[PDB]
């Protein structure tokens, strides 16, 4: 259709207005004193939230160009979310800060490309510096603290997460479900859990959790790669009857075969999901067997001259339920008999005795623990369905944040880490003045998170910012108590990973907008 | 009446639009290749001109705020005109260049007061530098050359001015009056000239020169203030007869008396003009006497118990012609007898001998010079009233330009002097970045004149500017021949005085607009 086309400044003011509406709506929810945002619903009462992502999803503007600016920066939160699962609001205020000053510099006549280069250089060095300052979240105490902090100071949620990770390990699978009513519940189910997700989406039958769930399915344990569907045809049909879904746990399911499975299960033609076998090399085969012993199946390896074509429903393993995430497979309640299973345990138990290497020893103990990984399930307390659904949300977020914290060290929270980094880069320079302005734009935007947190408290941003910059190290402002102190000692930490991600995605989208010269959209008609 | 009030940016864009319309209409007339501007008349054929002042006078805009901007910058040309009588177009392009970039800097967020301070510092240093590059027009040959060139190559006008300056000295008073018909006339009258203009307009009988001219008038020399007309009645009537105009040279003519004179001479009822007596205090009386000795009059002072009522046409002085400007009175060819006059000279001549103070010595030498300086009068040739009136105008301008040339000096024309000055200030800095921006705004504006001259030629401004800046000294672009060369050798010179004035007035008005925050005007109703 006929288009409306805008250039330079005309386009710039439109974009800026669009990012401001989005960022302003989102940033009021930042930190312990975040404010509420009410989102209208077509039916019933409006939604009241302090969740940034929830607000962003609702933002769409009337002016086509302003809407483009809003949808562009909205990409910042979504990418930061996908990558770290937290810090989307932080990423949004960093982006607004960089875009605002960057566009001002452009309007002033500065070279957009140089501005972007300067911003990029500052971010590159800032990230290195962020790593240098990064400390860990390994022990259960740290995990508890981060969990508590991520749960709005709810020490309860903190303990839960810590206990759940103590059961299945901090790398294990953990889920949260509605509670039976009052008092939380934590139980490990099959069963076993290993680090391997679906070999492709679509298998996802429950987009609510973005996971795949199968009930009383058959489990094919093939010790090899599967490229040709032909091999599956015989077993797939055997499973076609008995009306039960099939879980493929092979060394890997490549294009040809995988593509077919995706299409067939897409047409209701037999429900089948595929995931890679745990580990690699030798231990892979040994582990693929542990699953067999657990599900009562039989490994189909070519090493013993076995063919998938010559595989009956008797070779297949089976369990009451199996769940698979983007990167986790959990088999709940397997058919395997305690005789075989417990016997398998005894075997591996001796393996540990004959262990001549710590590495081999560790790997073996990992198997016995799993067989004797599973899935830790957290059932949220209650006392009224409303509160129960709420606490469930908090536990979910706290878990998500703590998981991120465990993966990559931690740094002082409350926006102080970025402020310390910015101060260390005061002498950073580029190839020219415009690049230097870009560097300064980035260092200035690095104070935005702390300033917005303070602003949401009802305090003065410049005063608090000035005071924090005055000290050093982990010295920061505790917005919950409105007292200065050592952020680490007060338990206010952020996973280095979310801080880094927030900054990189903010600078990335900001750089693109700053170097945008023209915009095209449908004519308002 | 109700007002429309605008602030900041809103006011700024209006002002800018207004100066742009005025400056753009005016600047097309700059230099040897200036284009024509057609100005509509209510009757007959339109006026076609290449004269900047003529164009500026017609500019008035419909938008009240835009019109304010145009009228404001119009002040630049008028002041530059009053001070140097040339370079009003140059001053206008300089003002537009400073205003344009200055307002851009303001919109960019820079401090107006600092921008103005930087612009002012640059101009202060630029003027000093202009003086340093300034070169002489001392001998009559040079005076004749400059005069000829200023008279559109009319060697006649050049000789006239040179002779006039040879009579009364290059620092002496010189006037131009209509000729008696064919052939020019140069005669020195009492002549004498002092710094006192008409005590009010209206007396101005020749708005062409905005001056008052009287022929063979009587001169009343009253040593006191005149408030009551009664005192004049007797003498005014005595002058009513003999059909001759009257020149009142009293200590001062206050309201009552002055008001009457303005009304009567307004109705053709006796032609009379009044001007204050030269000097003040004691010397005043001594000087009032010098005029008497020159015009053959008698000072009527109350000190000797004399009354204006008891004053006959015999007491009054007389001269063939007298001319008075806004601030100058010149008595040409007085009746006084060489015996009395020369004797008076001898007296004052001894006064200088007995002088015990330099000040008293200086003041005395001033009187002898006037009485022994007079006023040279140039009566322009003729051969038809039309041509006579035209040549008179040329002589007036040429004279004005030569006068300035004699005082200072000259610099390379074609805008190169300002370009050379700008390059010499490349390292100039202020107290902060905003002041530095102001400095750059001014140095950049200094290139506008040469650029506009080139643009009017139909050539490329940036190319020529780049080439001229590449060379040094008097190297410049001859817009008439479109060849580079030594501006002085090619005879392209500007009086340092007009270049300095154009720059100072441009900067002065630009500084005011740049620091304007609010505009008030009548509601368009
Ligand atoms: N007591 C506290 N004082 C200061 N800052 C705190 C405190 N508790 C938490 N924070 C900080 O608040 C920020 C996180 O706030 P919030 O969860 O509202 O936004 P986000 O994680 O950036 O985005 P999302 O909307 O995805 O949660 C981090 O900088 C965190 O360290
Ligand atoms: K929040
Ligand atoms: Mg968060």
Swiss-Prot record, chains A, B:
Signal peptide coordinates: none
Claim: Chaperone is one of the keywords in the record: yes
Binding positions for ATP per the UniProt entry: 29-32, 50, 86-90, 414, 478-480, 494
Pfam families in alphabetical order: Cpn60_TCP1
ATP-binding among keywords: yes
Subcellular locations according to the entry: Cytoplasm
UniProt superkingdom: Bacteria
GO cellular component, one term: cytoplasm
Catalyses which reaction(s): ATP + H2O + a folded polypeptide = ADP + phosphate + an unfolded polypeptide
Molecular functions per Gene Ontology: ATP binding; ATP-dependent protein folding chaperone; isomerase activity; unfolded protein binding
EC number, as in UniProt: 5.6.1.7
Keywords attached to this entry: ATP-binding, Chaperone, Cytoplasm, Isomerase, Nucleotide-binding
GO BP annotations, alphabetical order: protein refolding
Name of the top EC class for this enzyme: isomerase
Complex formation: Forms a cylinder of 14 subunits composed of two heptameric rings stacked back-to-back. Interacts with the co-chaperonin GroES.
UniProt-listed HAMAP family: CH60
Family designation: Belongs to the chaperonin (HSP60) family.
Task of the protein: Together with its co-chaperonin GroES, plays an essential role in assisting protein folding. The GroEL-GroES system forms a nano-cage that allows encapsulation of the non-native substrate proteins and provides a physical environment optimized to promote and accelerate protein folding.
Record's protein name: Chaperonin GroEL
Gene (UniProt): groEL
